[PDB]
From a paper:
Shiga toxin (Stx) is the major virulence factor of STEC and is an AB5 toxin consisting of a single A-subunit associated with 5 B-subunits (AB5). The B-subunit is a receptor-binding protein. Recently, we identified a new subtype of Stx2, designated as [name], in strains isolated from a broad range of hosts in China, including diarrheal patients, goat, pig, and raw meat (beef and mutton).
Considering the difficulty of purifying large quantities of [name] from wild type pathogenic bacteria, a recombinant construct encoding a non-toxic toxoid of [name] was generated by converting the glutamic acid at position 167 to glutamine (Stx2kE167Q). The E167Q mutation was chosen because E167 is known to be the active site residue for known ribosomal inactivating proteins (RIPs), including the Stxs, and because the E167Q mutation does not alter the structure of RIPs. Molecular-replacement resulted in a solution with two biological units in the crystallographic asymmetric unit. Each biological unit is composed of one A-subunit and five B-subunits. As expected, based on sequence identity, the structures of Stx2kE167Q and [name] are similar. Superimposing the active center residues of [name] and Stx2kE167Q revealed minimal changes in their spatial configuration, suggesting that any variation in toxin potency may be due to the internalization of the toxins dictated by the B-subunit, rather than the enzymatic activity of the A-subunit. In the crystal structure of [name] toxoid, there is a HEPES molecule in the active center of the A-subunit. Residues important for receptor-interaction have been identified by structural studies of [name] in complex with its receptor or receptor analogues. These residues constitute three sites for association with the host cell and are conserved between [name] and [name] except for AA16, which is part of site 1, and AA31, which is part of site 2.
Author numbering:
A (entry chain D), C (entry chain I), D (entry chain H), E (entry chain C), F (entry chain E): 1 to 70
B (entry chain B): 1 to 242, 257 to 297
The structure:
């Protein structure tokens, strides 16, 4: 499901080597190390990201995300 | 059209360049502060040029004002130099499209690029020195030139005159740093690595600055303008983008990041880093 | 074959760790991780890319892409 | 604990393959290799980073950090 | 030997996971995955690169390259 | 010790997978693959780098480096 869509408000590197972003007021984390530079890049260049997951509660995990340039 | 760069004093030098700028370019709405601006070259037809007379290098000489430099208008590239005492126009090979009525045109073997000129001159722009004295010898070298094959001494002269004419026209920083050599103290101007790097990013700066709208700063590759006054103090004239030198790749001139305007290609060039995780072998 | 040439309209990181881009109105995915940051940087700046593959149908995979300056 | 917060004053790759950044007048190192390019991009763009560690002594190590834009 | 000197006209990720650049009208490929982001960054910023290799015929391999601002 | 401070004049990827930079008129090389993206990014953005090594003569190696924007 499309959990959240918007700019990245903050990103965070977590001590367990996971990575979190806040999109549309709700936080989501991911385990995939390849997404860390992709997400920080989106945050810095103003890309609209669409977090996609089967579990969309704030604080939940994800591993699918679309990137649009604005 | 015809213009003159008068090297008599610092003030005649600055006024000469400003008169050329006023005629061939238009200030940017969002980067000007009185009579000091970043100006965009007005579009002229291909092959359009200006003939810039050189004068005032030795005021004890009523006949040292017979060197001219031909400068393509859309790009401020020096197409060649004219000896008015012998009515001979020595023209670089990449400018066959520039023709002058009533002057004996000589088509030369080599081109106008700094790579070609530095090689023949055995002199790198970075660290190169220019004084009133060495500009006089540069004038002598070009007026004593003959043939169709550039020499070491003529190439050194061109490199010096390009910096204090065309590059100074583009960059107020080069104008300001060099004009100190026109003092009675007669100091020596050294073209710094920073000065050279500015000329290597002229097209890149020209593509970014038209998008400026009061941001705290501007970042273009290795160039940093940390406030708007740093822009005006460095840049005077830019190309008209929308010229091939305006674009490297892509089609997004800038990315605004935290009230700093970035050349998008610069950001892309340090954002394409994979997870360092993957720096691995054979596992 | 040259399957599609143009700007990257959007990109998408997939849950199976593949990576999707839309070029010239068609979608293609790749399993080469090294391409992920390279393709995103092309997207941010408007670089036109050329997708190449034996399979050019929308939805097909790819592993060869040219980065052009036009 | 939020140990320090601000723009990155300088960064430094260390002989022991760790990476240190100076924030709010205090230095902090991390052995997390994926943070090296992320922290450099943050330093380059003037991101406001928040260093989070169980040990906030200047010169102490960390492995959690938040990245914010202006 | 200095095979070619100039800016990158295009780059290309190849199906065998090598990376090709065309410099001064000739094509050269390399096997070092580390050079892929480095070579694209040079293309993006218009760096003058110098391909160095025992074999300077167009279509040949390389693994040494200088990145100049000139 | 602090061997050289300034902007990177050029960099070179060497056949042996090491990486060379020229700073303040002298050359230095490093074996750490992780400095390759960091060093090149510093070059193309014009950071002022500070090379640090027990060995400070040109042509010598290093594995400690500070990055400043200014």
């Amino acid at each position: 499901a499309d959990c959240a869509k918007g700019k990245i408000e903050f990103s965070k590197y977590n001590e367990n080597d996971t990575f979190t972003v806040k999109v549309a007021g709700k936080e989501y984390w991911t385990n995939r190390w390849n997404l860390q530079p992709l997400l920080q890049s989106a945050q810095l260049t103003g890309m609209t990201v669409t977090i996609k997951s089967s579990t969309c509660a704030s604080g939940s995990g994800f591993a699918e995300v679309q990137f649009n340039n604005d | 059209q015809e213009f003159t760069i008068d090297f008599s004093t610092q003030q005649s030098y600055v006024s000469s360049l400003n008169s050329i700028r006023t005629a061939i370019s238009t200030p940017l709405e969002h980067i000007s502060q009185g009579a000091t601006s970043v100006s965009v070259i007005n579009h002229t037809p291909p092959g359009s040029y200006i003939s810039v007379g050189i004068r005032g290098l030795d005021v004890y000489q009523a006949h040292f004002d017979h060197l001219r430099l031909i400068i393509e208008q859309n790009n401020l590239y020096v197409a060649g130099f004219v000896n008015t005492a012998t009515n001979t126009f020595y023209r670089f090979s990449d400018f066959a499209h520039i023709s002058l009525p009533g002057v004996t045109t000589i088509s030369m073997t080599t081109d106008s690029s700094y790579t070609t000129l530095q090689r023949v001159a055995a002199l790198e722009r970075s660290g190169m020195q220019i004084s009133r004295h060495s500009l006089v010898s540069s004038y002598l070298a070009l007026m004593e030139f003959s043939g169709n094959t550039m020499t070491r001494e003529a190439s050194r002269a061109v490199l010096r005159f390009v910096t204090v004419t065309a590059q100074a026209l583009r960059f107020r920083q080069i104008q300001r740093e060099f004009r100190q050599a026109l003092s009675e103290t007669a100091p020596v101007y050294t073209m710094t690595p920073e000065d050279v790097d500015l000329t290597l990013n002229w097209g890149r700066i020209s593509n970014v600055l038209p998008e400026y709208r009061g941001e705290d700063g501007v970042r273009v590759g290795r160039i940093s303008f940390n406030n708007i006054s740093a822009i005006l103090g460095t840049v005077a004239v830019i190309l008209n983008c929308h010229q091939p030198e305006c674009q490297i790749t892509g089609d997004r001139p800038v990315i605004k990041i935290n009230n700093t305007l970035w050349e998008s290609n610069t950001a892309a060039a340090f954002l394409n880093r994979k997870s360092q995780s993957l720096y691995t072998t054979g596992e």
